[PDB]
Amino acid sequence: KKVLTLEGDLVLGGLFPVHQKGGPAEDCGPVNEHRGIQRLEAMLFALDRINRDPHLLPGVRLGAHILDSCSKDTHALEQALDFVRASAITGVIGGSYSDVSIQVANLLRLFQIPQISYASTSAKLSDKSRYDYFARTVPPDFFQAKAMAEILRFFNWTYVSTVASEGDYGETGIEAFELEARARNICVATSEKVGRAMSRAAFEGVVRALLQKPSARVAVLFTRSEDARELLAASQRLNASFTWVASDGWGALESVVAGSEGAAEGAITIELASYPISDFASYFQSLDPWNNSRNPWFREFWEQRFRCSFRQRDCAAHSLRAVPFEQESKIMFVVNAVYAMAHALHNMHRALCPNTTRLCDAMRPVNGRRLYKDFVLNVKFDAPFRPADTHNEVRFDRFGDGIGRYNIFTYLRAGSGRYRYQKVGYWAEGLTLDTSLIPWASPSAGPLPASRCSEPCLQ
Amino acid sequence: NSIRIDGDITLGGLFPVHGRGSEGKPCGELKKEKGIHRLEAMLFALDRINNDPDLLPNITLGARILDTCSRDTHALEQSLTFVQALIRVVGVIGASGSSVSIMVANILRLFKIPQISYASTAPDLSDNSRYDFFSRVVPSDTYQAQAMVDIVRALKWNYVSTVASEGSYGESGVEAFIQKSREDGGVCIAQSVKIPREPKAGEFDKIIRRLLETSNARAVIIFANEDDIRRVLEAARRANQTGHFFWMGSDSWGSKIAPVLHLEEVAEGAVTILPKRMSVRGFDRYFSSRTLDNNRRNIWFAEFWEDNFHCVKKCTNRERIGQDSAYEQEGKVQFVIDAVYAMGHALHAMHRDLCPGRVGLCPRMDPVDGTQLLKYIRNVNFSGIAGNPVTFNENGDAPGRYDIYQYQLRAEYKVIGSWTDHLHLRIQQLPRSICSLPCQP
Numbered sequence A: 001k002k003v004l005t006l007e008g009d010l011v012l013g014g015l016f017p018v019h020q021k022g023g024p025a026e027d028c029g030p031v032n033e034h035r036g037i038q039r040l041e042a043m044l045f046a047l048d049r050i051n052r053d054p055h056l057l058p059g060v061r062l063g064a065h066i067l068d069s070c071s072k073d074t075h076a077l078e079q080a081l082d083f084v085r086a087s088a089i090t091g092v093i094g095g096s097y098s099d100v101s102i103q104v105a106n107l108l109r110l111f112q113i114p115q116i117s118y119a120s121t122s123a124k125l126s127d128k129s130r131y132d133y134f135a136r137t138v139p140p141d142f143f144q145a146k147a148m149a150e151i152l153r154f155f156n157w158t159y160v161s162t163v164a165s166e167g168d169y170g171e172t173g174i175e176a177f178e179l180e181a182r183a184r185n186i187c188v189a190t191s192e193k194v195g196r197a198m199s200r201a202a203f204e205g206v207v208r209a210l211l212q213k214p215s216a217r218v219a220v221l222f223t224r225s226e227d228a229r230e231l232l233a234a235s236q237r238l239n240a241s242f243t244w245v246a247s248d249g250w251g252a253l254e255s256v257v258a259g260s261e262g263a264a265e266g267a268i269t270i271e272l273a274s275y276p277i278s279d280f281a282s283y284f285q286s287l288d289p290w291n292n293s294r295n296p297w298f299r300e301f302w303e304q305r306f307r308c309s310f311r312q313r314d315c316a317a318h319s320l321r322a323v324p325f326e327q328e329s330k331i332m333f334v335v336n337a338v339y340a341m342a343h344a345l346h347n348m349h350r351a352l353c354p355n356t357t358r359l360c361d362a363m364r365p366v367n368g369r370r371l372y373k374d375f376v377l378n379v380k381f382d383a384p385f386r387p388a389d390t391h392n393e394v395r396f397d398r399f400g401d402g403i404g405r406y407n408i409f410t411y412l413r414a415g416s417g418r419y420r421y422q423k424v425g426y427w428a429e430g431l432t433l434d435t436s437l438i439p440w441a442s443p444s445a446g447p448l449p450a451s452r453c454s455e456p457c458l459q
Numbered sequence B: 001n002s003i004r005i006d007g008d009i010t011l012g013g014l015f016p017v018h019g020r021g022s023e024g025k026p027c028g029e030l031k032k033e034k035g036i037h038r039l040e041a042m043l044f045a046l047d048r049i050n051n052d053p054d055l056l057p058n059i060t061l062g063a064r065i066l067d068t069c070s071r072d073t074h075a076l077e078q079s080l081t082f083v084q085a086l087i088r089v090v091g092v093i094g095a096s097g098s099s100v101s102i103m104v105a106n107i108l109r110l111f112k113i114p115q116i117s118y119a120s121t122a123p124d125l126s127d128n129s130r131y132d133f134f135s136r137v138v139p140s141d142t143y144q145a146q147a148m149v150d151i152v153r154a155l156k157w158n159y160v161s162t163v164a165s166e167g168s169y170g171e172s173g174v175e176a177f178i179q180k181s182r183e184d185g186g187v188c189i190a191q192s193v194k195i196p197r198e199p200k201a202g203e204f205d206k207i208i209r210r211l212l213e214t215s216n217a218r219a220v221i222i223f224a225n226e227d228d229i230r231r232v233l234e235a236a237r238r239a240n241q242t243g244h245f246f247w248m249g250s251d252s253w254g255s256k257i258a259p260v261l262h263l264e265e266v267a268e269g270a271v272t273i274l275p276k277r278m279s280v281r282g283f284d285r286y287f288s289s290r291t292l293d294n295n296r297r298n299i300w301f302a303e304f305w306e307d308n309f310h311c312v313k314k315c316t317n318r319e320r321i322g323q324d325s326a327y328e329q330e331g332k333v334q335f336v337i338d339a340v341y342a343m344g345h346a347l348h349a350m351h352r353d354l355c356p357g358r359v360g361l362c363p364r365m366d367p368v369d370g371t372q373l374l375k376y377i378r379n380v381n382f383s384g385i386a387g388n389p390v391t392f393n394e395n396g397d398a399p400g401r402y403d404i405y406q407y408q409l410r411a412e413y414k415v416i417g418s419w420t421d422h423l424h425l426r427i428q429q430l431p432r433s434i435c436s437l438p439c440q441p
């Protein structure tokens, strides 16, 4: 359909979930304002800096072939054939969804096409037997269930209920969480699984099942962004009080809680620790639907955000520099993925063609055997746009993963401030969050909400 | 390695003549029952459609059968040959493996090649939205889950434990069984056992420890592959638990010598479920007739000759299959005979409509379209070689009709019931696996 066609000596692939899944409706419709265009423009912003960096691939002019997956594994694989028409895709940077990334990885493995995923926490891509050409910067779902299991132990939450999202992300998270919960003496109640495409009436069924064990006031949530909002919407209707322990799917984005914002007051969400990019903030803010002709989806993005139309002579007045800008918490991973092979290509260029800073006729046929195997090795380099007084470094382990750095978020309802996400701790191989910042954990608030199956009995 | 036959149109096929290999090796020990016994069945079926003139007259059918060593990863690399030109086969026969067939169904739909499987019973594979071109000739495992609940209820079983293997079959098998178990509310699951894809030697020993931990869970239900049932059964002998556990087997443990070979001590008193089948006489006088220097098309037939007969030196060519005392005409050999027949009948119907009067392959349908052929497959209605009616549905599944087999000693499987619509089990087995014995009035 619509794809980016940036040109250069060698082009670089991409796969972003621009649109939302339509289910029984059309394949995918409305765009994503935080995990879509914001991540889509992050790659272009990173590519522009590399193309103008004298110390990173001089005279190479990296291209872009960003496709569209829009949160559909079948749709992602259907258009993934464009990445393999030549076999010239030297690499693919995409797979924001675990289900999407798994399907693309299998196809690209046959043609030896290295792939980097900026957001894929499933604890199965680390298996090199099945995916030997896969690398990523985000940690797997291994040092993520322990963080949530320890939080439950920290609050002495023993009897809990788990909600799983059908696919290759929720099921993997539940299995990792289940074994950690058993090893930490955490009781497990009935577990309910939600399908990828289910009616809104079915979403009321699972919340009813969670209400059928009333000593389970704590619900552990393993769902994608499009599956957690429906449960929250199903919580206002048939009103119930359930505190939420959220996975990476919930995140700190202010769209899964918008609307049904009263049913997740005591919700704890764990995201991936990162820092905002000051340079990217100016790039995204200083954008217009007319000047920015590189992105075919920018015109559609200007319809949902800054509500207007391009037919009745509307728009052309709103500017992104006026309204506040909320940067996605995973923009750092997107710009790190682009720079991951940018230095690797420079390292490959320095060794394969040590004659001039151009193509030496030997790197024209790109092979995954020599590239990825030399790419999974030490590509240790300073993180781009790193803030001051920090020692962050981009590197890959033997499994092609990143370091296990996490953070803890809670949902606030402060007066004269509507609602706001506040960071209350991090996970540096151990819990460090404080108790005085959580509204329901404050000493001057009453007993904390707990979920024990049998009130303990004294001697 | 390929066994391609030259023909006007070629038919893809995936058969697991080998097994999963440990360590870095992607292939393991040669599988006699799965694979080779079904490999020549399609070849025999392909050699019978090309003989009679009532089906596809003056049209010879080729083949592009490949090797899948019971490995999901290895199955995708081989399947690239089917769509190498379209980056030409008209149809591809799906592999027995549930997880293997899934990875072939999500890539063949991109290039629009219909797929017909014979031994994959994944409830997931019934989703039309994700698997457009996948067709099945066997009932799904979701019907087996209801059947097992009916069987255990008739046996008054109350406390059972479930064992599942890693993949899309074991995980989707017990999950369907557990959900249907809660619907009736009569039986409950003691615990769930997960078998890793590549575990250690002592991992299987730990599996029986958890089963023995709940000593009152006398009956255990296993959803495992062909090579996993034997290993778990062997661990029971080394733990001195011969007769303590009664095994509840799925369609992966039908009438098969291999899971009960040299293990007829723990396998006793085990009841299993297999779909409708019959002993075809045509294939009885075909496998026993093929010998060395005759079936030179099958490369792996030489390996089959070495492994089966030697079971060493002096490999003389003076032995026959009939005297091996190991040929049993495996149950799922029938399901691949009519699988190609259903696809062949669809091609015959397509040939008549798109080529009126032209006996040969008319140029109007030379670039065969998978989408056009897909609707023909859904409307195939004929009788198989044994006599069973072959009919598909809107999702490409098959009607649920099974048989109940119980392993007896006299070492031969005997029919003890059926699951036509509700149940037909007739009383053997012994009443056990009942926790919370009556505590008197």
Ligand SMILES: *[C@@H]1O[C@H](CO)[C@@H](O)[C@H](O)[C@H]1NC(C)=O
Binding pocket: A153, A154, A155, A156
């Ligand atoms: C309960 O949690 C508190 C911290 O809030 C701490 O005393 C300990 O982790 C738990 N104590 C008991 C008795 O469970």
Ligand SMILES: *[C@@H]1O[C@H](CO)[C@@H](O)[C@H](O)[C@H]1NC(C)=O
Binding pocket: B381, B391
């Ligand atoms: C196939 O033909 C039979 C012939 O009696 C009849 O049941 C019907 O037309 C077809 N069956 C199904 C299940 O569609």
Ligand SMILES: N[C@@H](CCC(=O)O)C(=O)O
Binding pocket: A035, A096, A097, A098, A099, A119, A120, A121, A122, A169, A224, A248, A249, A330
């Ligand atoms: N890592 C989560 C969410 C990724 C994202 O969209 O930010 C997943 O695999 O579903």
Ligand SMILES: N[C@@H](CCC(=O)O)C(=O)O
Binding pocket: B034, B096, B097, B098, B099, B119, B120, B121, B122, B169, B225, B226, B251, B252, B332
């Ligand atoms: N249908 C089961 C059993 C296949 C077999 O080995 O016959 C599966 O897909 O694993």
